[PDB]
Design an enzyme around this catalytic site. Structure first.
Site, PDB file in Angstrom:
ATOM      1  N   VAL A  57       0.725  -1.202   0.000  1.00  0.00           N
ATOM      2  CA  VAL A  57       0.000   0.000   0.000  1.00  0.00           C
ATOM      3  C   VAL A  57       0.757   1.255   0.000  1.00  0.00           C
ATOM      4  O   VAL A  57       1.279   1.781   0.976  1.00  0.00           O
ATOM      5  CB  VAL A  57      -1.137   0.074   0.910  1.00  0.00           C
ATOM      6  CG1 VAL A  57      -1.943   1.276   0.431  1.00  0.00           C
ATOM      7  CG2 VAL A  57      -1.910  -1.220   0.831  1.00  0.00           C
ATOM      8  N   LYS A  64      -6.494   6.946  -3.636  1.00  0.00           N
ATOM      9  CA  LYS A  64      -7.691   6.447  -4.233  1.00  0.00           C
ATOM     10  C   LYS A  64      -8.673   5.998  -3.214  1.00  0.00           C
ATOM     11  O   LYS A  64      -9.839   6.184  -3.372  1.00  0.00           O
ATOM     12  CB  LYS A  64      -7.365   5.394  -5.296  1.00  0.00           C
ATOM     13  CG  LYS A  64      -7.235   6.026  -6.679  1.00  0.00           C
ATOM     14  CD  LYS A  64      -6.122   5.501  -7.596  1.00  0.00           C
ATOM     15  CE  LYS A  64      -4.840   6.342  -7.548  1.00  0.00           C
ATOM     16  NZ  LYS A  64      -3.933   6.117  -8.681  1.00  0.00           N
ATOM     17  N   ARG A 141     -24.388 -21.479 -19.708  1.00  0.00           N
ATOM     18  CA  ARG A 141     -23.877 -22.515 -18.795  1.00  0.00           C
ATOM     19  C   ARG A 141     -24.310 -23.961 -19.188  1.00  0.00           C
ATOM     20  O   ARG A 141     -25.262 -24.162 -19.981  1.00  0.00           O
ATOM     21  CB  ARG A 141     -24.372 -22.226 -17.390  1.00  0.00           C
ATOM     22  CG  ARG A 141     -23.806 -20.966 -16.741  1.00  0.00           C
ATOM     23  CD  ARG A 141     -22.370 -21.094 -16.216  1.00  0.00           C
ATOM     24  NE  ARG A 141     -22.201 -22.110 -15.167  1.00  0.00           N
ATOM     25  CZ  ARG A 141     -21.065 -22.313 -14.490  1.00  0.00           C
ATOM     26  NH1 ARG A 141     -19.959 -21.578 -14.708  1.00  0.00           N
ATOM     27  NH2 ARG A 141     -21.041 -23.271 -13.561  1.00  0.00           N
ATOM     28  N   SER A 172     -16.544 -29.494 -11.953  1.00  0.00           N
ATOM     29  CA  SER A 172     -17.551 -29.387 -10.918  1.00  0.00           C
ATOM     30  C   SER A 172     -18.598 -30.439 -11.143  1.00  0.00           C
ATOM     31  O   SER A 172     -19.280 -30.834 -10.208  1.00  0.00           O
ATOM     32  CB  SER A 172     -18.172 -28.004 -10.897  1.00  0.00           C
ATOM     33  OG  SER A 172     -18.444 -27.618 -12.243  1.00  0.00           O
TER      34      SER A 172
END
Ligand SMILES: [Mn+2]
Ligand SMILES: [Mn+2]
Ligand code: NA
Ligand code: NA
Length: 327
Positions: A57, A64, A141, A172
């Site tokens: 950081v 921002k 899908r 899956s």
DNA sequence: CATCTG
DNA sequence: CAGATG
């Protein structure tokens, strides 16, 4: 997980854009470790400074964050969501075969839309062509109900060509999932392994067959081990044909099937945990093998696997039905 | 990582 | 061959 959501999100939009529109791999890469660390972060980031405090950081991001925090938006983010050039790239990119690289060229040539694409089907290569031809079907899908039919076919054909083939539909579809995106098939045969010097036919013979019977409809890429294609469940009694589906098939030396098989089956999370534990239990696991970890720092030697059982076993773990491989 | 393109 | 896509 929800405390630093927006921030981790905006950072993402930002990172993404860098890499895809600009080429800012550095920058792009910047947003990412950043959202990664803010993501892990236990409190409510109440300000930039507070953030900055973190690794990854910087001042720029801190900046921002301030603005975003201060106000429900980010200018830069607003300027990018408008910009048609940015938009195009996120779009064209949706075509199988079109990466960002290519997304840029075309835009700079004025191809920004689907029509643009069709009209200039000449500039597109084969994959790209295909991707274009099936843009719709592509994004649809895959319902389990189809998956099962598909699987059914694939398995019956592989069998026919050689009783010795070993095929598995990972993904899956394997983990339960009501729908999938593409069909991933793992392939091996006894006669193929680690040492065994090749046998390309091993993959080609089936690919043929699948096309023989018309399941496979097109070829995306065809190597000696990996095949990228398109298939399709025979339209029954004409009125309802099926969408075209992405399909991949890969040959694997028998001696490293289950690791792969496990591996492909995921989920990522299931893996890691399994990997982490594997590590505890005095092991190492990867896409192809499990290895007894030496103490010297590291060390290996391919532990012998004859199923996913053998694997877990090793790590002295609870055999997980694929459904429970969730996390 | 394996395939393609040019 | 470097470089791009998946
Ligand atoms: Mn899949
Ligand atoms: Mn896939
Ligand atoms: Na794409
Ligand atoms: Na270079």
């Amino acid at each position: 997980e929800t405390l630093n959501g927006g921030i981790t999100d905006m950072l993402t939009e930002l990172a993404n854009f860098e890499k895809n529109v600009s080429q800012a791999i550095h920058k792009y890469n910047a947003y990412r470790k950043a959202a990664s660390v803010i993501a892990k972060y236990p409190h409510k980031i109440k300000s930039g400074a507070e953030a900055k405090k973190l690794p990854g950081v910087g001042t720029k991001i801190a900046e921002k964050i301030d603005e975003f925090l201060a106000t429900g938006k980010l200018r830069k983010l607003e300027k990018i969501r408008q910009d048609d050039t940015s938009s195009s790239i996120n779009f064209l990119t949706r075509v199988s075969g079109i990466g960002p690289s290519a997304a840029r060229k075309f835009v700079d040539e004025g191809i920004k839309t689907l029509e643009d694409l069709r009209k200039n089907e000449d500039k597109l290569n084969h994959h790209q062509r295909i991707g274009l031809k099936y843009f719709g079907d592509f994004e649809k899908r895959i319902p389990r109900e189809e998956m099962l039919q598909m699987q059914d076919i694939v398995l019956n054909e592989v069998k026919k060509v050689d009783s010795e083939y070993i095929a598995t539909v990972c993904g899956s579809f394997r983990r339960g999932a009501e729908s999938s995106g593409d069909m991933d098939v793992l392939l091996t045969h006894p006669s193929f392994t680690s040492e065994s010097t090749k046998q390309p036919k091993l993959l080609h013979q089936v690919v043929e067959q699948l096309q023989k019977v018309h399941f496979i409809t097109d070829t995306l890429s065809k190597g000696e081990t990996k095949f990228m294609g398109v298939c399709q469940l025979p339209s029954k009694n004409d009125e309802k044909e099926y969408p075209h589906r992405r399909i991949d098939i890969r040959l694997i030396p028998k001696d490293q099937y289950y690791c792969g098989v496990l591996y492909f089956t995921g989920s990522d999370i299931f893996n890691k945990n399994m990997r982490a534990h594997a590590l505890e239990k005095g092991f190492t696991i990867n896409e192809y093998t499990i290895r007894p970890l030496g103490v010297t720092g590291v060390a290996g030697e391919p532990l012998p696997v004859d199923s996913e059982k053998d694997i877990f076993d090793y790590i002295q773990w609870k055999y997980r039905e694929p459904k429970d491989r969730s996390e």
